[PDB]
Amino acid sequence: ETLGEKWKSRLNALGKSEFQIYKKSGIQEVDRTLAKEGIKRGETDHHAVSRGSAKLRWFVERNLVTPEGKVVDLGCGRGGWSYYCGGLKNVREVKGLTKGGPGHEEPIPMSTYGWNLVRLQSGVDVFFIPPERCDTLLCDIGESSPNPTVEAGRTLRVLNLVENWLSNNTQFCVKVLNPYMSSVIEKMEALQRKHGGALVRNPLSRNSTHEMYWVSNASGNIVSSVNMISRMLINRFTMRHKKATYEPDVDLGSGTRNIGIES
C-alpha cells in the first residue's frame, strides 16, 4: 500500500473522541464567530461567506495562484472563493457555477468589495456543461469518503473536469481530494507534464483530510510532495500541545469596484 492508505485506515480506526482531537491538532484555524453572527444577522458587507475565503487567501498571498482577468469558480457553493476573487486588483470578471439546491450550499448574495464583478449561478452541474474560456480556473470540489477508492475516483473526475477547462496559460488552484491513491498520482503526473504547477498543502486543512492543491505557480515532484504530507499527518497522530492556531478572518471590503472601500 501507500503511506496514505495506511494513514487513512489508521484514521478510520480512531475512537470518536480521539478523532475529534486529531482533526484539529496543530493546524491553522480562521477565527469566524463574528463573521458568522453577522451573516446570520443579514449583513452583507465585510464578511466572508465561509471559511473558504481565508483558505483561498493563503494561496494568493503566497503567489501560488494569481487570479487575473476572467475567473471561473467551478463548484462554488456559498461563494467564498468567488467574492474573494472579486476584490482583487487584476480580476476583471468572476463566474462561479454551482449545483446547490437542497442538501447543497446555495450561493449567498453579498455586497463585499467587487461584488459587481461576481456572477454566481446555482442549479448547474459543472461536470456536464461545456468549458467556457478563462484566465483563472478554480475548483474546490471533493466530498471526502472513508473509502479511499471512492475518494480516488471523485478526485479523478475533478481532475478530468479541470483538464477540459485548461488552456496554455491559465492560472489555477484545484483541490486534489485524495492525492495518495496511485491512479490519482498517475493522473497528476500526466497533468503536471501538460500544465505545470505542483501540489501544495494548506495549513488550514484539517488533519482528517489528505487534500492537497494543484496550484499553477509552484513546482516539486508529485510523489515526494504527497509522501511528505502523508508522513506529516502520520506524525500528528502522536502529538502533544494540541490547540489549533487562529487567524483573523478576511475583511472583504464593501461596494462597487473603485469607489468603493477595498479589502
Ligand X SMILES: C[n+]1cn([C@@H]2O[C@H](COP(=O)(O)OP(=O)(O)OP(=O)(O)OC[C@H]3O[C@@H](n4cnc5c(=O)[nH]c(N)nc54)[C@H](O)[C@@H]3O)[C@@H](O)[C@H]2O)c2nc(N)[nH]c(=O)c21
Nearer to ligand X among residue 36 and residue 206 (C-beta): 206
Size of the site for ligand X (CB under 6 A): 12
Alpha carbon 104 to its chain centroid, in Å, reads: 17
At its nearest, how many Å lie between ligand X and the CB of residue 57? 21
Q: Which of 50, 75, 92 is nearest to 250 (CA)?
A: 50
| Cα dihedral: 21, 26, 28, 30 (round 10) | 40
Whole-angstrom distance, CA of residue 198 vs CA of residue 15: 34
- When asked if residue 14 is in the footprint of ligand X (CB under 6 A), the reply is yes
Binding mask 193-222 for ligand X (x = CB under 6 A): -------------x-xx-------------
Whether residue 92 contacts residue 84, with contact meaning beta carbons closer than 8 Å, is answered with no
Q: Report in angstroms how near the CB of residue 248 gets to ligand X at its nearest.
A: 23
Cα separations (Å) of 12 from 1, 145, 227?
Answer: 16, 10, 19
Of 46 and 175, the one with the shorter C-beta distance to ligand X is: 175
Query: Which runs of E-coded beta strand occur in the chain?
Result: 28-30, 69-74, 91-97, 118-121, 136-139, 171-176, 198-200, 212-215, 245-247
In the complex, minimum distance from the CB of residue 44 to ligand X, in angstroms, rounded to a whole number: 27
Annotated binding residues, written as ranges, equal 50, 80-81, 98-99, 125-126, 213
Return the residues of window 24-83 that contact ligand X according to CB under 6 A: none
Quote the CA–CA distance of 66 and 191 in Å, as a whole number: 19
**Selected binder of ligand X within 19, 122, 150, 262 (CB under 6 A):** 19
What is the footprint of ligand X within residues 106-145 (CB under 6 A)? 144-145
Distance of closest approach, residue 149 Cβ to ligand X, in angstroms? 12
Q: Site residues (CB under 6 A) for ligand X?
A: 11-12, 14, 16, 19, 23, 144-146, 206, 208-209
